[PDB]
């Protein structure tokens with residue numbers, strides 16, 4: 001049972017800008033997703049301070065980076081607070097309408113796309129390198145869901161009956177054919193070292209057979 005939704009016009013416009021603007025510094029997508037994971041982990045850690053049972057769905061707070069060259073996917077997994085179905089539908093838990101407004105004003109004033117996270121809409125930088133993004137998520141207060149979009153103005157949401165996640169979010173980047181450098185160990189290590197040095201959770205880069 002798959003529900004298809006239209007993005008809000010402003011978010012479709014954000015996505016089209018990210019996909020169509022010439023802009024070479026695409027590697028910042030990984031910084032932005034890791035920052036989103038860190039923010040999600042901070043949230044479940046805060047809730048656990050007064051309610052330890054919030055970690056019954058998983059005590060370890062971490063981020064895994066999983067490249068798969070056969071599937072052409074880079075997966076960012078975190079064990080943070082996760083998203084409810086409403087969060088997914090409401091722009092993956094962001095205030096993306098007002099964030100997009102500010103971001104586009106900043107761009108016209110001289111900012112560049114690398115500054116997207118300052119506007120709270122860093123998730124959509126995934127579309128710098130991905131033709132399709134799939135988000136699997138599980139919040140303590142809801143079932144497990146899959147969100148997906150190849151842009152083009154719509155996204156889908158379904159209940160996910162696949163591999164159970166415990167708690168947190170998994171962003172599966174189906175990379176564009178010319179962006180496979182982001183599956184290479186040395187390239188991922190370089191970007192994490194450059195941009196994510198002060199993320200306060202373990203970031204494990206999986207290796208491939």
Ligand SMILES: Cn1ccc2ccc(C(=O)O)cc21
Nearest residue numbers: 159160161162163164165166
């Ligand atoms: C890939 N994978 C790992 C654990 C697991 C459990 C269920 C399913 C499924 O498709 O139901 C897939 C799974």
